[PDB]
Amino acid sequence: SALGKLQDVVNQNAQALNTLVKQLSSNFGAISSVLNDILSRLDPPEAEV
Amino acid sequence: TKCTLKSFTVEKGIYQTSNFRVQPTESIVRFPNITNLCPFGEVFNATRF
Amino acid sequence: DSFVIRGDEVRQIAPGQTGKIADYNYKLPDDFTGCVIAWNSNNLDSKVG
Amino acid sequence: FQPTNGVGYQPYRVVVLSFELLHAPATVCGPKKSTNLVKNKCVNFNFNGLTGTGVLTESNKKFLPFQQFGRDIADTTDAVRDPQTLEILDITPCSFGGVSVITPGTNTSNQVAVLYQDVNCTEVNVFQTRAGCLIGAEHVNNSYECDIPIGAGICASYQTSQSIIA
Amino acid sequence: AYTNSFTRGVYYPDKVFRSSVLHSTQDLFLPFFSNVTWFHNPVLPFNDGVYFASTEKSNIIRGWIFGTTLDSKTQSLLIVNNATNVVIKVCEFQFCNDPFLGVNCTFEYVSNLREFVFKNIDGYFKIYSKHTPINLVRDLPQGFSALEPLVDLPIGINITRFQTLLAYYVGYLQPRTFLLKYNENGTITDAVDCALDPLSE
Numbered sequence: 201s202a203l204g205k206l207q208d209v210v211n212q213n214a215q216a217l218n219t220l221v222k223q224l225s226s227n228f229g230a231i232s233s234v235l236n237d238i239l240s241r242l243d244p245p246e247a248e249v
Numbered sequence: 250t251k252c253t254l255k256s257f258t259v260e261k262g263i264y265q266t267s268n269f270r271v272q273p274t275e276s277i278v279r280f281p282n283i284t285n286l287c288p289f290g291e292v293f294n295a296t297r298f
Numbered sequence: 299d300s301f302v303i304r305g306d307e308v309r310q311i312a313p314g315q316t317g318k319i320a321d322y323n324y325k326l327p328d329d330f331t332g333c334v335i336a337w338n339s340n341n342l343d344s345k346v347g
Numbered sequence: 348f349q350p351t352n353g354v355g356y357q358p359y360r361v362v363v364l365s366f367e368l369l370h371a372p373a374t375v376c377g378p379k380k381s382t383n384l385v386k387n388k389c390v391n392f393n394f395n396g397l398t399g400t401g402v403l404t405e406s407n408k409k410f411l412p413f414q415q416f417g418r419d420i421a422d423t424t425d426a427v428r429d430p431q432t433l434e435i436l437d438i439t440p441c442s443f444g445g446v447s448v449i450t451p452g453t454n455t456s457n458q459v460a461v462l463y464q465d466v467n468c469t470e471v472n473v474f475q476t477r478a479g480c481l482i483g484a485e486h487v488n489n490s491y492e493c494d495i496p497i498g499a500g501i502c503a504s505y506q507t508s509q510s511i512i513a
Numbered sequence: 514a515y516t517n518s519f520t521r522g523v524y525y526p527d528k529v530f531r532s533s534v535l536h537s538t539q540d541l542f543l544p545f546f547s548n549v550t551w552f553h554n555p556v557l558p559f560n561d562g563v564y565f566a567s568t569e570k571s572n573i574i575r576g577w578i579f580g581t582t583l584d585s586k587t588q589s590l591l592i593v594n595n596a597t598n599v600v601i602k603v604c605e606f607q608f609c610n611d612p613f614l615g616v617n618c619t620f621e622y623v624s625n626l627r628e629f630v631f632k633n634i635d636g637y638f639k640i641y642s643k644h645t646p647i648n649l650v651r652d653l654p655q656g657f658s659a660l661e662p663l664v665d666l667p668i669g670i671n672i673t674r675f676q677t678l679l680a681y682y683v684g685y686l687q688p689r690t691f692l693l694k695y696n697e698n699g700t701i702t703d704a705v706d707c708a709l710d711p712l713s714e
């Protein structure tokens with residue numbers, strides 16, 4: 201743990217990236233977090249929204 | 250680089266302009282083995298109607 | 299653009315619509331800009347036979 | 348029915364197929380055949396319920412008899428079970444990377460070099476560096492002060508009849 | 514009677530592989546150290562899924578009945594293991610007052626401690642199971658073990674009540690959040706109920 205600071209820096213960055221990646225799994229109000237499913241399932245007028 | 254920087258002249262340096270991505274050469278679709286055919290034979294081929 | 303359809307198909311004359319008329323007869327763009335006007339013409343286009 | 352009847356009086360067998368769709372789970376679907384699978388090539392794939400783009404490779408994992416889709420730590424699909432062949436395929440997303448353009452100032456010259464970041468030189472006077480594939484740069488042994496940084500200790504610059512060197 | 518459900522009732526919530534990962538998922542689980550009813554063929558509710566467990570030395574317990582009325586008025590699941598053959602039917606069976614065995618059909622299929630999890634979500638009847646040896650009579654064994662999925666019936670019949678066909682234990686799922694530990698081999702080796710205690714929180 202003596203080198204904590206350095207390790208800490210690394211840790212923080214990783215978490216950030218992880219969080220960013222996890223944001224791809226959120227629907228943000230859409231019907232599905234997967235873009236391909238929305239494209240293939242809905243008609244263009246609503247798939248656009 | 251000229252267009253990505255919006256200028257007709259570029260200073261010395263290294264710039265990022267686009268992304269190289271290999272495109273998928275063809276498509277593949279995989280589903281389980283087709284079994285359990287609906288018994289349409291028992292209907293269309295019945296001996297008595 | 300002038301033509302004649304049946305009443306049930308009037309809904310199909312609109313951007314982002316599907317069906318017989320929309321798919322195979324007259325297709326508007328999804329970003330269509332303009333007006334659609336439809337009126338019954340039973341007195342004019344119908345015949346006893 | 349007598350066999351000597353005219354067609355209008357001869358018997359015809361009729362079958363009426365009705366297709367009912369209720370608010371209950373569907374149990375009658377059509378074949379939805381499949382095709383062959385290819386490995387070591389970038390493909391757009393659609394397995395049982397999932398779709399994606401990537402390269403399918405022979406795996407090293409031991410999926411359970413009931414497991415279908417892998418998953419990495421960051422909720423990303425990692426491996427799949429082929430529905431027909433009982434083999435587990437790793438999904439490695441197809442190669443990609445930035446295309447950096449190393450240039451001396453256009454004032455001096457118009458010759459340039461191209462660095463494809465983090466790829467082998469096979470998938471594109473070629474230099475394979477830890478930063479990627481560099482094209483148009485003459486690789487020399489003599490060391491000099493860094494002018495245009497590339498990465499991993501490699502720098503490029505325009506030097507003497509004159510050309511770009513890394 | 515009542516018994517403690519120490520750490521039992523954890524089942525693979527899907528068919529997704531994960532290695533050396535701590536995953537947080539919310540679903541219907543059996544709360545840790547809760548009460549489970551202990552019996553030595555009463556009809557019980559099926560609120561939101563049922564965890565069922567049996568200790569056997571002579572194969573007394575045979576099958577299950579699920580439904581709403583189970584009196585030939587509406588379809589009802591009947592699952593029976595006749596001594597070599599597993600049979601599942603969903604006919605509108607007319608049941609007896611005490612349907613014991615000697616000491617309109619829309620689907621039909623034919624094929625110590627045992628744990629099963631039956632639940633019904635969006636018209637799908639998930640049946641998870643697990644078998645293990647045991648040397649104990651008077652109570653459930655303390656320990657951890659995961660239940661794999663065995664059957665996913667597309668039956669679509671909504672269930673409210675169920676009954677057994679023959680000591681066993683019955684517990685009722687609740688909508689809790691759990692943390693599951695997947696080892697390198699894809700199997701669940703430990704779980705933490707996220708609402709059990711401050712330390713688990």
Ligand SMILES: *[C@@H]1O[C@H](CO)[C@@H](O)[C@H](O)[C@H]1NC(C)=O
Nearest residue numbers: 281282283284430431432433
């Ligand atoms: C699926 O069918 C192919 C031939 O069509 C056969 O080689 C393969 O073993 C079958 N798979 C299963 C799981 O039955």
Ligand SMILES: *[C@@H]1O[C@H](CO)[C@@H](O)[C@H](O)[C@H]1NC(C)=O
Nearest residue numbers: 288289290291292293294295
């Ligand atoms: C009836 O039998 C014939 C063989 O003579 C076959 O070609 C046909 O597919 C059968 N009908 C159906 C509906 O399968």
Ligand SMILES: *[C@@H]1O[C@H](CO)[C@@H](O)[C@H](O)[C@H]1NC(C)=O
Nearest residue numbers: 258260261452453454455456
């Ligand atoms: C371009 O190069 C010329 C020498 O030919 C020099 O006089 C001029 O200052 C340079 N301009 C810039 C912007 O570097």
Ligand SMILES: *[C@@H]1O[C@H](CO)[C@@H](O)[C@H](O)[C@H]1NC(C)=O
Nearest residue numbers: 439442465466467468469470
């Ligand atoms: C690039 O080539 C090296 C050896 O030539 C190989 O080990 C490496 O896996 C290749 N890169 C990729 C992305 O496969």
Ligand SMILES: *[C@@H]1O[C@H](CO)[C@@H](O)[C@H](O)[C@H]1NC(C)=O
Nearest residue numbers: 484485486487488489512513
């Ligand atoms: C650089 O030196 C290596 C040996 O250290 C030699 O193989 C290579 O050909 C040399 N390249 C140039 C451009 O001198």
Ligand SMILES: *[C@@H]1O[C@H](CO)[C@@H](O)[C@H](O)[C@H]1NC(C)=O
Nearest residue numbers: 515516544545546547548549
């Ligand atoms: C089980 O029931 C007893 C009384 O019947 C009660 O005291 C106890 O709190 C219950 N267990 C739990 C976990 O609530």
Ligand SMILES: *[C@@H]1O[C@H](CO)[C@@H](O)[C@H](O)[C@H]1NC(C)=O
Nearest residue numbers: 408409410696697698699700
């Ligand atoms: C995981 O499986 C491999 C073989 O599939 C086995 O050698 C290994 O012991 C297993 N891991 C554990 C912890 O048992």
